[PDB]
Write a protein that binds this ligand. Structure first.
Ligand SMILES: *Cc1c(COP(=O)(O)O)cnc(C)c1O
Ligand SMILES: *Cc1c(COP(=O)(O)O)cnc(C)c1O
Ligand SMILES: *Cc1c(COP(=O)(O)O)cnc(C)c1O
Lengths: 711, 711, 239
């Protein structure tokens, strides 16, 4: 942050001479001097260049063309406008947040002006930063406290060992000095919730529209366990979603509760929809309570909004129909439904306080923002007990938190505040919609097959596309209107291979081959398997990372139409088995795999397996208790009808749970076991595309074995 | 790491000219050149300077005086020794780990020599570093993988926001690029336990002498909950120690178990002793099973070795008498009992594998070592199930681990191997024993009172001082011989105020006043209260931080003997209440507080409130379940006899739990309640010395209120 | 105040090389480096030279010949003595007011040492100066309060008149900026006897051994008439 802009040139000498005198004075205090051209040149030095903090221009030349466009971006940006004798303000410059510093063109006083710019720049740094981060930067420059924790103390022990100097010289001197514990008085403690840590909870909850926002220092997987251990007594009843995360499964195995699994909608491509509106009724919830032994009235509800693919729900209807005093929204993929008008009334934080209910959300931080890993938040919207919920937070957070991550957790909330932060949300949407239009443009004009985006036929609007009932792009049979939404920054590329009715085609390329082809240039697919490609268009994906994805997609069509070899296209796959992948081309591998999907019938065995629910014998908490005693055995996959599993089956593809730890596969759940046996055959002929199921252990013959409980 | 040493000067020209040519060639690749003097000069450039990697000296001048002393400090240190025609090795140079690189004195070939030194230095970096850290540094320089987590992606989003540029330029470009997740193929995943993470777990266990070890990324407070949820089913029995940490109490509140509390020993100064050998017998443990309702055979035992003060136990006797198949050693304060001959047979890792049993340890990393915060380990010594213990580790660790801390967790283990790591533990012991002798030397020679070290009368030896039964320095009534040891690096300063029999004295200065004076200059006190002080002398405490404590202690005697004012000595305490601390001196405050301790009788009420354990009605797990329902109330401190508390009482001083959440104060635990009422009167007359009890809420009248359960 | 003294030469290289690295680091923050000779050379750099604030010497060479003579002159001079491995204090060094800052002989860490010396020097300036003077010096470097008396406002009106530029360039920029009235909140007022002016009356009366000391701004000739108008009734008698 040391860029000073000097716009325009009056041509006279009594105004350009102080500019040259100030040019030699600002460089003595480490400041870069730039000279833009016209008015459009200065506008390009703010959005693209974020390290600017000084604009020098004539006040009697552009008093209305510059004080309006700059205020729409950065409001606290200092403006070093130079006025004259006959200078005044304007009536249209009253409702604009600006910082204008007036000066003269006196000779010899250039040294005093340089001291005022440095003092004004320090005021801009001490304003846009939160008080918790301000105390961390000041402690590094000013701090002589000895006998503190940890033992490195800014890197003292690293300067004594030869191997330790390599780890200290990589990051930097200011990196280790900012890693301190709660042994500081002027910074407070995280567990005590006082001092700088007290104002941080009120600053994040005010920007993100909340009442009590904490800072989890162990990722989102840990924040979900704190919510479940507050409104779920022993032997109670919770309403957890079927498409739950791996951490959500362990929550049911650590608390003696009776969960009720829902039945979300799904199609044939593997993209799971959402929970229908009929499941939120009072006649549907009360029906499953009597059918499930040892279950009372549900007091907590876990709703995955959005899912792993990015599908927003309708919170305006759930907060009125669902009669649960503790409704949870797993917002681990939408930490931005507030800074845009096309996201109002779509999350739990949007709106007001529900009478008699509370909203708990675990918004991620190191997922689609800009902060260090293992960072999350706990949003509280309601009137709850502070002394009771505080005891549950200390059961998952250490007494010595890492301030390097805590400072970055609140920074993500400060980088989004103001118009300068709102441009990152709207900018990511404009770059996502532009990428959606480039696919349809390069599809009809091309000569052959091309990728397709799972989007409606009309994408001219800039909002969330609802999933209506008279459309064919979503493919969800019997879907509720005004319930399922679409995330514009979640582009799902549908590879050719299937029709629009749900059946199979003749010519197509699976998404597994494209997933490994993008890794050669440096593109990792978030979700792949059947015929889908999920990507993330967050604030980190700029205009360079967005355009590089389309170029790699056009190279796959060129290498496939010309019929190239595997060695001269996929060098990583060739190193796995050079003998088998010798005389094989890109067309022979793409056609052989496509015939195996039609032969084994994947869409039918997948739509019927994840739809039905296996018979749940005991609670998931009781399944983990029997494993600790040692009554577990390893049986084959073909010998498990009527047994109780111990681990959760997470088959890839797609990536959703199949059998919960504690269920039994009887005669009703027959297609459930058929889906596991189908993947063991299709993923054994060609190397590289082996079967990936979290729970099945590979032996020395090919048959996978699972861990069940002894009878 | 770019320091090249050129020792000695032959005086001839055919040997010094290649040195001058090499001086201009090494500077082109960024390398510092130093010219040491005699043999003692080069020895000081290794212990003090750690960024050295090149030693150039004549082979036919010091072939035995240098190859032996350098080998005792570093093994893989390159030695660029220049040999001659009549040069040979020595018989005493066969059992020494050295890296000698021979060269010649040829002119013009100085450029080829510089390329050999650069490659040798690169081989030194790729050898002393673990493969997990080496792969992380190479991924930063060589790594262009896009569309990966987290969202910052090396600091891309920070370059677009004006406030984000200040947070990115603080750490460094190489800091954000190393913060990657499991979206990398050539680095593997932490939960998968494969690739670089698989070899890292086998490397850490080999350094710390173990079979298998994990890497907890949430401090020691989280690692204790992973082991506790592995050998303690719902409704079992555990043997947890009374002197437990805040995280250890939450372990009993999250699992339906029946714990059995021990009775550790203690003196009058507040130093926590240890558990006697009689509690580890078979007739003692089985006696408390029948007396405790709903309790079976104990299947797990938790031992805090060492305690918060620093007193080791005897693992050679516990692993044979204590008949527990799962014995735990909370090693949160001794992560060094391995690389020293005076620490053999004192921890769980020292020795062999105990048949039919298993040892668990949670060695802290960000406590007395050199790494980032929130880092711990789980050492397992025995034969346990790999498929079962892995599920318990994922219930407390997120799916996206922060590799910036994981790389530092293994780095702390890599800094211990070799002679360069052994000098860090022994170096802190020599600096600790030297500081212990400086106190006794300045005690008799001084004129007046002086501080005392809780140590035996004979400290000439260099080992752990055993707590015998014929001594008066420890002050433990009926202590077991060859069971309690003293930690040399844990120097416990005793302030004059009590006698050797356990009574009081007329002239005395509390330790709370000295703790406030040390914070003024910049010294953080670890533990303080009655008449004791605790400090941490780890590997990070060099000779500068050690000598800075003695100077602050001598300044306190000068300011107290001359009778100075509080404003001219304690500026922080004066700002709390300038009106009350106006005409008060340093001698008036030190005498008024000492009379309050004798009047209220602190040593007698504290010693009798910790021995008598309150009546435990229900398990600690059932106490937290009743709080979530809402049956809690806030009553006064004087009205609570016969009630069940909800939280844990942690009074300061000292720092041990008083009443566990779920116990009841009846007629047997009468001195227990008297200890809480005594601190409310002594900590309410003088500002700054308020009562600090974790669990008591301060009202508007002075009487503290606690949270209990409804009847 | 920017004189750093480096006494004695051990003759070795692991101790003189950090001195050479520190010589180039202290000059970047405007600090003069002097190389005294023997023990009598350092004693002449304190009584004669008053702009000294840093003394660097070996702790294991003169631990009793320097910690006693310097304490008799300046009892608050920051000492930058460098200790070794086998270094300790002395029983005769307990009743002496000193400020010893210990360091080491490590390469590459010369930049961190320069930041500690500048921070320690700032602590010495904030200690030897009274709080009333501290508020005046801080207001010049940090203070943009306009529309306040006097009318010159740090010399603003002198930059407009040709004759006024000769009177402003004679004293200095910091001279006119330190001439402010009672139009500042964080400095109080002399007539109100509050804030920095209240602590100034207790700081002067304590050093000069008094109970209530004021500050007359019109010489002694005026202060004599202030006392005369307090204990002299109309038609009384004075001596
Ligand atoms: C990715 C994810 C998590 C894990 O996030 P972390 O911050 O790494 O713990 C948890 N829940 C959901 C729904 C996720 O998508
Ligand atoms: C300090 C301490 C802890 C907490 O350590 P962290 O690594 O910060 O979680 C846990 N247990 C004991 C016995 C401790 O002394
Ligand atoms: C010199 C003198 C004065 C005048 O002193 P000023 O500070 O200049 O006012 C007053 N009284 C006596 C006795 C003097 O000698």
């Amino acid at each position: 942050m040391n860029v000073i802009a000097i716009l325009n040139h009056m041509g006279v000498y009594f105004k350009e001479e102080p500019i040259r005198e100030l040019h030699r004075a600002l460089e003595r205090l480490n400041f870069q001097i730039v000279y833009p051209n016209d008015r459009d040149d200065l506008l390009k030095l703010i959005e693209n260049n974020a390290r600017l903090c000084g604009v020098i221009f004539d006040w009697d030349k552009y008093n209305l063309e510059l004080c309006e466009e700059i205020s729409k971006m950065n409001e606290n940006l200092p403006l070093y406008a130079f006025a004259n004798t006959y200078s005044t303000l304007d009536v249209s410059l009253n409702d604009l947040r600006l910082q204008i510093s007036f000066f003269e063109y006196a000779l010899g006083a250039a040294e005093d002006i340089a001291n005022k710019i440095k003092q004004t720049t320090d005021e801009y740094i001490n304003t846009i930063l939160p008080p918790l981060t301000k105390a961390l930067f000041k402690y590094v420059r000013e701090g002589k406290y000895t006998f503190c924790t940890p033992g490195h103390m800014g890197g003292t022990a690293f300067q004594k060992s030869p191997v330790g100097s390599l780890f200290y010289d990589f990051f930097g001197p200011n990196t280790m000095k900012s890693d301190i514990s709660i042994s500081v008085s002027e910074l407070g403690s995280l567990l005590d919730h006082s001092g700088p840590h007290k104002e941080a909870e009120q600053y994040i909850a005010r920007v993100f529209n909340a009442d009590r926002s904490y800072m989890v220092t162990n990722g989102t997987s840990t924040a979900n366990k704190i919510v479940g251990m507050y409104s779920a007594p022993a032997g109670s009843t919770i309403l957890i979603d079927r498409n739950c995360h791996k951490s959500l499964t362990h929550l049911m195995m650590m608390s003696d509760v009776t969960p009720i699994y829902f039945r979300p909608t799904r199609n044939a491509y593997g993209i799971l929809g959402g929970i229908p509106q009929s499941e939120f009724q009072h006649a549907t919830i009360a029906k499953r309570v009597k059918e499930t032994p040892n279950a009372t009235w549900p007091v907590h509800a876990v709703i995955t909004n959005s899912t792993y693919d990015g599908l927003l729900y309708n919170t305006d209807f759930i907060k009125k129909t669902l009669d649960v005093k503790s409704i949870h929204f797993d917002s681990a993929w939408v930490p931005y439904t507030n800074f845009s008008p096309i996201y109002e009334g779509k999350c739990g934080m949007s709106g007001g306080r529900v009478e008699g209910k509370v909203i708990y959300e675990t918004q991620s931080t190191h997922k689609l923002l800009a902060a260090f890993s293992q960072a999350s938040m706990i949003h509280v919207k309601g009137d709850v007990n502070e002394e009771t919920f505080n005891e549950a937070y200390m059961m998952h957070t250490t007494t010595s938190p890492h301030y390097g991550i805590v400072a970055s957790t609140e920074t993500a909330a400060a980088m989004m505040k103001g118009n300068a932060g709102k441009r990152l949300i709207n900018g990511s949407i404009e770059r996502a919609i532009k990428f959606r239009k480039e696919i349809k443009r390069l599809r009809t004009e091309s000569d052959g097959w091309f990728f397709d985006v799972w989007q409606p036929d009309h994408i001219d609007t800039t909002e969330c596309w609802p999933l209506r009932s008279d459309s064919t792009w979503h493919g969800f049979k019997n879907i509720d209107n005004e319930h399922m939404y679409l995330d514009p920054i979640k582009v799902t590329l549908l590879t050719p291979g299937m029709e629009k009715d749900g059946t199979m085609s003749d010519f197509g390329i699976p998404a597994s081959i494209v997933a490994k082809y993008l890794d050669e240039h440096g593109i990792v697919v978030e979700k792949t398997g059947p015929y889908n490609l999920l990507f993330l268009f967050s604030i980190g994906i700029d205009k360079t990372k967005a355009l590089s994805l389309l170029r790699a997609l056009t190279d796959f069509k060129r290498a496939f139409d010309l019929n190239l070899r595997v060695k001269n296209m996929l060098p990583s796959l060739y190193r796995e088995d050079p003998e088998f992948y010798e005389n094989m081309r890109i067309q022979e591998l793409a056609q052989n795999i496509h015939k195996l999907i039609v032969h084994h019938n994947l869409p039918d065995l997948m739509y019927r397996a994840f739809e039905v629910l296996p018979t749940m014998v005991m609670t998931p908490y009781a399944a983990f208790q029997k494993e600790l005693h040692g009554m577990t055995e390893e049986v084959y996959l073909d010998e498990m009808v009527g047994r109780i599993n111990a681990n959760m089956i997470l088959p890839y593809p797609p990536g959703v749970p199949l059998v919960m730890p504690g269920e039994m596969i009887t005669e009703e759940s027959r297609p459930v076991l058929e889906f596991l046996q189908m993947l063991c055959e299709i993923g054994a002929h060609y190397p590289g595309f082996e079967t990936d199921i979290h729970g099945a252990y590979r032996q020395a013959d090919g048959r996978y074995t699972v861990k069940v409980l002894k009878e």
